[PDB]
Design an enzyme around this catalytic site. Sequence first.
Site, mmCIF file in Angstrom:
data_model
loop_
_atom_site.group_PDB
_atom_site.id
_atom_site.type_symbol
_atom_site.label_atom_id
_atom_site.label_comp_id
_atom_site.label_asym_id
_atom_site.label_seq_id
_atom_site.Cartn_x
_atom_site.Cartn_y
_atom_site.Cartn_z
ATOM 1 N N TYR A 99 -8.504 -35.851 7.936
ATOM 2 C CA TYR A 99 -9.820 -35.231 8.254
ATOM 3 C C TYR A 99 -10.868 -36.295 6.973
ATOM 4 C CZ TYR A 99 -12.090 -30.492 6.930
ATOM 5 O OH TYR A 99 -13.013 -30.188 7.283
ATOM 6 N N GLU A 106 -12.785 -31.052 13.216
ATOM 7 C CA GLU A 106 -13.786 -29.322 13.069
ATOM 8 C C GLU A 106 -14.365 -29.192 14.237
ATOM 9 O OE1 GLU A 106 -15.302 -27.654 10.661
ATOM 10 O OE2 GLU A 106 -13.129 -28.304 9.236
ATOM 11 N N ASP A 110 -14.472 -15.781 14.787
ATOM 12 C CA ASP A 110 -14.738 -16.978 14.238
ATOM 13 C C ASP A 110 -13.709 -17.555 13.187
ATOM 14 O OD1 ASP A 110 -17.261 -16.332 13.145
ATOM 15 O OD2 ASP A 110 -18.215 -17.311 14.526
ATOM 16 N N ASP A 113 0.881 -1.295 -0.619
ATOM 17 C CA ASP A 113 -0.221 0.007 -0.237
ATOM 18 C C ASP A 113 0.804 1.382 0.079
ATOM 19 O OD1 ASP A 113 -2.939 1.022 0.334
ATOM 20 O OD2 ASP A 113 -2.188 1.883 1.674
ATOM 21 N N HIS A 123 -17.967 -31.484 9.264
ATOM 22 C CA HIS A 123 -18.642 -30.334 9.148
ATOM 23 C C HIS A 123 -20.215 -30.722 9.856
ATOM 24 C CE1 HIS A 123 -15.862 -28.697 6.148
ATOM 25 N NE2 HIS A 123 -15.914 -28.139 7.177
ATOM 26 N N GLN A 140 -2.715 3.784 4.578
ATOM 27 C CA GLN A 140 -3.802 3.738 4.892
ATOM 28 C C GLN A 140 -5.010 3.300 4.698
ATOM 29 O OE1 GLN A 140 -3.891 8.487 4.645
ATOM 30 N NE2 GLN A 140 -4.752 8.246 6.132
ATOM 31 N N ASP A 183 -19.317 -34.560 2.512
ATOM 32 C CA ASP A 183 -18.842 -34.093 3.591
ATOM 33 C C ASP A 183 -17.518 -34.882 3.841
ATOM 34 O OD1 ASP A 183 -17.375 -31.659 5.012
ATOM 35 O OD2 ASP A 183 -19.741 -32.613 6.456
ATOM 36 N N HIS A 191 -6.859 -25.355 12.410
ATOM 37 C CA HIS A 191 -6.088 -26.252 12.109
ATOM 38 C C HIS A 191 -4.937 -26.592 12.187
ATOM 39 C CE1 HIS A 191 -10.871 -27.861 10.401
ATOM 40 N NE2 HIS A 191 -10.616 -27.087 10.288
ATOM 41 N N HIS A 223 -11.153 -20.570 13.486
ATOM 42 C CA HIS A 223 -10.581 -21.713 12.970
ATOM 43 C C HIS A 223 -9.665 -21.572 11.994
ATOM 44 C CE1 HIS A 223 -14.386 -24.780 11.388
ATOM 45 N NE2 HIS A 223 -13.331 -24.963 10.974
ATOM 46 N N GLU A 224 -9.696 -21.730 10.621
ATOM 47 C CA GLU A 224 -9.006 -21.682 9.862
ATOM 48 C C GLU A 224 -7.309 -21.915 11.244
ATOM 49 O OE1 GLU A 224 -10.033 -22.827 7.704
ATOM 50 O OE2 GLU A 224 -11.949 -21.736 7.333
ATOM 51 N N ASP A 232 -29.384 -15.310 12.249
ATOM 52 C CA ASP A 232 -27.967 -16.953 11.402
ATOM 53 C C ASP A 232 -27.090 -17.066 11.906
ATOM 54 O OD1 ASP A 232 -28.107 -15.647 9.445
ATOM 55 O OD2 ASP A 232 -28.744 -16.892 8.034
#
Length: 316
Positions: free
Chosen positions: A157, A166, A138, A57, A231, A61, A226, A146, A142-143, A200
């Site tokens: 996994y 998970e 979150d 950048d 998940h 800013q 999955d 892992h 979360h990532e 939600d």
Amino acid sequence: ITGTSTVGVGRGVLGDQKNINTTYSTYYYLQDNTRGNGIFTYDAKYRTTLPGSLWADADNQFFASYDAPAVDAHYYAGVTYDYYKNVHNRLSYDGNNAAIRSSVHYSQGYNNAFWNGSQMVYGDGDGQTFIPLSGGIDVVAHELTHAVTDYTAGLIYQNESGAINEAISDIFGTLVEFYANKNPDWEIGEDVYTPGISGDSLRSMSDPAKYGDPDHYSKRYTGTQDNGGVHINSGIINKAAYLISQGGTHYGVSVVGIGRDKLGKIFYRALTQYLTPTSNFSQLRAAAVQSATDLYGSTSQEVASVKQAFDAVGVK
Ligand SMILES: [Ca+2]
Ligand SMILES: [Ca+2]
Ligand SMILES: [Ca+2]
Ligand SMILES: [Ca+2]
Ligand SMILES: [Zn+2]
């Protein structure tokens, strides 16, 4: 790159202003030298080639709409690093201050984010289902969690081991959200999910069933989708974690809550000392009970609550 450490200012995905650590060398880069071997944020420029280019950048800013996802990915990676260091005495994900790298603007209208074994990747969402995923603390935690799991338990996994993998990411993603005190809750991804619908989230730890996920072992998914429902079945463990912390009566079984801090200590110890790549739900229960035993004693309320929580979700 080599340069002078400084502090810039910008706005995140949700429009909030925050200060971010940058590095100056002709341009101002999203490189934070204050944490471990550094936190680096890259621009994937709507392509799928990784990591892309280190974010540069001209004026330090970051108020452009295009900057938003980068500001949050950079900032929240820092908060997550702080959580693990200050609360669990862990230096970065590998325990040895490994550099943390994130790429934003991955692909076009990508409704997902992930850890690829080497770095974090964030899509911008399609604007309907998701807005830039790095806007959720979150999600970021979360990532990064892992990555922690990869360097410790190494949970495969797939099937039950994957569901635990998970759940661990949802659990610590939530604990980091509480740590930052950013409108904390036991819901997952509420800040970036369906901008046109309020109230939600993608998943719920307090009531997984609200979104169709199982909240008892008897309702576990046994199909192949999955990766064996990683998940989906995570809901069983998330509910157990919620009960351990907050308490409550589930399917007739009463659990006395012991709080978030102890939940974190118990699960972090289980993850780093007892879990293995092929651990299943029953083994997670044993690991959690043993961890609580090590920390609070075999006849403690803490051990009692862990047992009650797993009994409540049907995990023996
Ligand atoms: Ca600028
Ligand atoms: Ca929240
Ligand atoms: Ca949340
Ligand atoms: Ca929503
Ligand atoms: Zn995950």
